[PDB]
Design an enzyme around this catalytic site. Structure first.
Site, short mmCIF file in Angstrom:
data_model
loop_
_atom_site.label_atom_id
_atom_site.label_comp_id
_atom_site.label_asym_id
_atom_site.label_seq_id
_atom_site.Cartn_x
_atom_site.Cartn_y
_atom_site.Cartn_z
N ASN A 297 -7.75 11.02 -20.30
CA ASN A 297 -7.04 9.84 -19.83
C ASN A 297 -5.78 10.26 -19.09
O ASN A 297 -5.36 11.42 -19.13
CB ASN A 297 -6.73 8.87 -20.98
CG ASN A 297 -5.74 9.43 -21.98
OD1 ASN A 297 -4.63 9.87 -21.62
ND2 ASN A 297 -6.12 9.43 -23.26
N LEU B 114 -3.56 16.59 -29.75
CA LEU B 114 -4.17 15.49 -29.00
C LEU B 114 -4.51 14.30 -29.88
O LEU B 114 -4.83 13.23 -29.35
CB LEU B 114 -5.44 15.99 -28.27
CG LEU B 114 -5.17 17.11 -27.26
CD1 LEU B 114 -6.48 17.55 -26.62
CD2 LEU B 114 -4.18 16.68 -26.19
N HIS C 143 -5.91 10.82 -27.47
CA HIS C 143 -7.23 10.78 -26.87
C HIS C 143 -8.22 10.29 -27.91
O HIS C 143 -8.16 10.69 -29.08
CB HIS C 143 -7.62 12.18 -26.39
CG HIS C 143 -6.71 12.68 -25.32
ND1 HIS C 143 -7.02 12.59 -23.98
CD2 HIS C 143 -5.47 13.23 -25.39
CE1 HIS C 143 -6.01 13.08 -23.27
NE2 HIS C 143 -5.06 13.47 -24.10
N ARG D 263 -12.76 21.16 -14.95
CA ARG D 263 -11.65 21.86 -15.58
C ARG D 263 -12.16 22.54 -16.84
O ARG D 263 -12.60 21.87 -17.77
CB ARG D 263 -10.53 20.88 -15.91
CG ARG D 263 -9.42 21.51 -16.67
CD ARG D 263 -8.35 20.49 -16.98
NE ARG D 263 -7.66 20.03 -15.78
CZ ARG D 263 -7.07 18.86 -15.69
NH1 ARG D 263 -7.14 17.97 -16.68
NH2 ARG D 263 -6.42 18.54 -14.57
N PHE E 136 -9.65 26.44 -25.18
CA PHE E 136 -9.27 25.05 -25.41
C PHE E 136 -10.39 24.03 -25.20
O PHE E 136 -10.80 23.38 -26.17
CB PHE E 136 -8.04 24.69 -24.57
CG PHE E 136 -6.81 25.45 -24.97
CD1 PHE E 136 -6.05 25.03 -26.05
CD2 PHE E 136 -6.42 26.59 -24.28
CE1 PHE E 136 -4.92 25.73 -26.43
CE2 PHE E 136 -5.29 27.30 -24.66
CZ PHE E 136 -4.54 26.86 -25.73
N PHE F 291 -13.81 15.41 -22.52
CA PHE F 291 -13.71 16.84 -22.74
C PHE F 291 -14.40 17.22 -24.03
O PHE F 291 -14.56 16.40 -24.95
CB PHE F 291 -12.26 17.37 -22.72
CG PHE F 291 -11.37 16.78 -23.79
CD1 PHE F 291 -10.91 15.47 -23.69
CD2 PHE F 291 -10.97 17.55 -24.88
CE1 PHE F 291 -10.07 14.93 -24.67
CE2 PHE F 291 -10.13 17.02 -25.85
CZ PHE F 291 -9.69 15.72 -25.75
N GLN G 84 -13.84 20.15 -19.51
CA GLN G 84 -13.61 18.76 -19.13
C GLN G 84 -14.44 18.41 -17.91
O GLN G 84 -14.50 19.18 -16.95
CB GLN G 84 -12.12 18.53 -18.81
CG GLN G 84 -11.78 17.11 -18.41
CD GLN G 84 -10.29 16.89 -18.23
OE1 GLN G 84 -9.48 17.67 -18.73
NE2 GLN G 84 -9.92 15.83 -17.51
C1 LIG Z 1 1.80 23.82 -20.52
C2 LIG Z 1 0.43 24.17 -20.01
N1 LIG Z 1 -0.59 23.23 -20.49
C3 LIG Z 1 -1.41 23.39 -21.61
C4 LIG Z 1 -1.39 24.55 -22.51
C5 LIG Z 1 -0.99 24.36 -23.83
C6 LIG Z 1 -0.97 25.43 -24.71
N2 LIG Z 1 -0.63 25.24 -26.04
C7 LIG Z 1 -0.44 26.39 -26.94
C8 LIG Z 1 0.15 26.04 -28.29
N3 LIG Z 1 -0.44 24.82 -28.83
C9 LIG Z 1 0.05 24.58 -30.19
C10 LIG Z 1 -0.04 23.72 -27.96
C11 LIG Z 1 -0.62 23.87 -26.57
C12 LIG Z 1 -1.36 26.68 -24.25
N4 LIG Z 1 -1.73 26.90 -22.98
C13 LIG Z 1 -1.75 25.87 -22.11
C14 LIG Z 1 -2.22 26.19 -20.70
C15 LIG Z 1 -3.49 27.01 -20.70
O1 LIG Z 1 -1.22 26.91 -19.98
C16 LIG Z 1 -1.49 26.97 -18.58
C17 LIG Z 1 -2.20 22.25 -21.75
C18 LIG Z 1 -1.85 21.36 -20.69
C19 LIG Z 1 -2.31 20.10 -20.32
C20 LIG Z 1 -1.76 19.47 -19.21
C21 LIG Z 1 -0.77 20.12 -18.47
C22 LIG Z 1 -0.30 21.37 -18.80
C23 LIG Z 1 -0.85 21.99 -19.92
C24 LIG Z 1 -2.24 18.15 -18.76
C25 LIG Z 1 -2.12 17.62 -17.52
S1 LIG Z 1 -3.11 16.23 -17.36
C26 LIG Z 1 -3.50 16.35 -19.04
N5 LIG Z 1 -3.00 17.39 -19.65
C27 LIG Z 1 -4.37 15.34 -19.72
C28 LIG Z 1 -5.74 15.22 -19.03
N6 LIG Z 1 -5.74 14.12 -18.09
C29 LIG Z 1 -6.51 14.12 -16.99
O2 LIG Z 1 -7.13 15.11 -16.62
C30 LIG Z 1 -6.62 12.82 -16.30
C31 LIG Z 1 -7.01 12.81 -14.84
C32 LIG Z 1 -8.02 12.42 -15.85
C33 LIG Z 1 -8.52 11.00 -15.97
C34 LIG Z 1 -6.79 14.99 -20.10
O3 LIG Z 1 -7.17 13.87 -20.43
N7 LIG Z 1 -7.31 16.11 -20.70
C35 LIG Z 1 -8.24 16.08 -21.83
C36 LIG Z 1 -7.60 16.81 -22.99
C37 LIG Z 1 -7.19 18.20 -22.55
C38 LIG Z 1 -6.29 18.16 -21.30
N8 LIG Z 1 -6.90 17.37 -20.23
C39 LIG Z 1 -6.07 19.55 -20.78
O4 LIG Z 1 -6.54 20.00 -19.75
O5 LIG Z 1 -5.33 20.27 -21.62
C40 LIG Z 1 -5.19 21.68 -21.31
C41 LIG Z 1 -4.65 22.40 -22.54
C42 LIG Z 1 -4.77 23.90 -22.31
C43 LIG Z 1 -5.49 22.02 -23.77
C44 LIG Z 1 -3.20 21.97 -22.83
#
Ligand SMILES: CCn1c(-c2cc(N3CCN(C)CC3)cnc2[C@H](C)OC)c2c3cc(ccc31)-c1csc(n1)C[C@H](NC(=O)[C@H]1C[C@@H]1C)C(=O)N1CCC[C@H](N1)C(=O)OCC(C)(C)C2
Ligand SMILES: Nc1nc2c(ncn2[C@@H]2O[C@H](COP(=O)(O)OP(=O)(O)NP(=O)(O)O)[C@@H](O)[C@H]2O)c(=O)[nH]1
Ligand SMILES: [Mg+2]
Lengths: 170, 164
Positions: B102, B122, B126, B55, B60, B113, B63
């Site tokens: 997680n 976060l 995390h 990922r 951002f 990540f 991962q």
């Molecule tokens: C709303 C759309 N969206 C967004 C998002 C958020 C913003 N913001 C803009 C303004 N600011 C102030 C706030 C945030 C902008 N653009 C988007 C995205 C690009 O729009 C498509 C995120 C996100 C994360 C999840 C679901 C939907 C989500 C999610 C779904 S599972 C998860 N997180 C946690 C993830 N567990 C797993 O994998 C488990 C299976 C393993 C063991 C996990 O440990 N990590 C590590 C940390 C990062 C996280 N993954 C991840 O990938 O974060 C993606 C990120 C883009 C950072 C946040």
């Protein structure tokens, strides 16, 4: 050509939004948890003797990003509101999801189906009558599903298409 | 007590991209740092070598760490499939932060990540346990292969890894 219907699947983390969508599209189920960021799928289906094209948005249930749901609620034409029958909190989240859709659409009349998923599991905590009553109060259909057995999966998505059709032709 | 250092040699569709090194904050999170260190050396009989970054979301993070299922759902720690959140002392302060992925409280395994931006929301969710030392531009270069939902357009692998 054939009509395209924009469906959006919403609900709390872990209720089975992705499992339902992948059963519909790909005809399989795995018990692994792959929490969704955002996924889009396409499938053509025959509903009521006519072919149409489903464009399905599978959304994240992450509570942290609840303020970022507005753009997809604006573009979506109908919504599958999913809870799990063994998760009372996911059922209580339904009100908050429907209310958010109403605000973004600025309408009390948005195509929507209430879905009670995981009906293959014992130890149900949300009664069928309790869910039918709530859907009755919303004026939307209620369907019980299992992404594991496929029970009700086609019916849930097809019913939502019929709701969108009725709304467009109204 | 010097914090330990580990490296990943990154490849793109099997061709070398370069080496990223990390300082692991054993001074603050010894249990989490030791997990990542041992997984990087492979000394328990399993670990990061050969696994992919599944990922990558430009703006951002990158991962990876699922070496058991290679589909973004797996991984395991040296303590068992899951272990508890050690502490949240350190924060996601900017690019280069190394932190545990997680699926909710107390579900750390092997997935991790690397931040390419500050991700303050976060904090407290995390466990931050390290940071990029050398090769931040390699992590930046990995963003070229990501997308809005994180699906990668080339196979981004840890071709080799170990302790320095
Ligand atoms: C709303 C759309 N969206 C967004 C998002 C958020 C913003 N913001 C803009 C303004 N600011 C102030 C706030 C945030 C902008 N653009 C988007 C995205 C690009 O729009 C498509 C995120 C996100 C994360 C999840 C679901 C939907 C989500 C999610 C779904 S599972 C998860 N997180 C946690 C993830 N567990 C797993 O994998 C488990 C299976 C393993 C063991 C996990 O440990 N990590 C590590 C940390 C990062 C996280 N993954 C991840 O990938 O974060 C993606 C990120 C883009 C950072 C946040
Ligand atoms: N027994 C059973 N398990 C199910 C059913 N639907 C989903 N699951 C399981 O419940 C877990 C969560 O499913 P998933 O589809 O990822 O839920 P989600 O609503 O998409 N979660 P997220 O919002 O994080 O993307 C998985 O382990 C999946 O196998 C069902 O009908 N029956
Ligand atoms: Mg999902």
């Amino acid at each position: 050509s054939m009509t395209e219907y924009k469906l959006v699947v919403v609900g709390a983390c872990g209720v089975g939004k992705s499992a339902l969508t992948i059963q519909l599209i790909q005809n399989h189920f795995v018990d692994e948890y792959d929490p969704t960021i955002e996924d889009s799928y396409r499938k053509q289906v025959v509903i009521d003797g006519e072919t149409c094209l489903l464009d399905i948005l599978d959304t994240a249930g992450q509570e942290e990003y609840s303020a970022m749901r507005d753009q997809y609620m604006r573009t979506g034409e109908g919504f599958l509101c999913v809870f799990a029958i063994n998760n009372t909190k996911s059922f209580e989240d339904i009100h908050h999801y429907r209310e958010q859709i109403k605000r973004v659409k600025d309408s009390e009349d948005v195509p929507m189906v209430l879905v009670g998923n995981k009906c293959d599991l014992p130890s149900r905590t949300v009664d069928t009558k309790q869910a039918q009553d709530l859907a009755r109060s919303y004026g939307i259909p209620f369907i019980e599903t299992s992404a594991k057995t496929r029970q009700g999966v086609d019916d849930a998505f097809y019913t939502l298409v019929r709701e969108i059709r009725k709304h467009k032709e109204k | 007590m010097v914090n330990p250092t580990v490296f990943f040699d990154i490849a793109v569709d099997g061709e070398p991209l370069g080496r990223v090194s990390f300082e692991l904050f054993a001074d603050k999170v010894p249990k989490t740092a030791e997990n990542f260190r041992a997984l990087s050396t492979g000394e328990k009989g399993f670990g990061y070598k050969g696994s992919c970054f599944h990922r990558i979301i430009p703006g951002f993070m990158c991962q990876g760490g699922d070496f058991t299922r290679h589909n973004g759902t797996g991984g395991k720690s040296i303590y068992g499939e899951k272990f508890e959140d050690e502490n949240f002392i350190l924060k996601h302060t900017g690019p280069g932060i190394l932190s545990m992925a997680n699926a909710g409280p107390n579900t750390n395994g092997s997935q991790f990540f690397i931040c390419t931006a500050k991700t303050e929301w976060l904090d407290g969710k995390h466990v931050v346990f390290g940071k990029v030392k050398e090769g931040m531009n390699i992590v930046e270069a990995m963003e070229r292969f990501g997308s809005r939902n994180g699906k990668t357009s080339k196979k981004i692998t840890i071709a080799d890894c170990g302790q320095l």
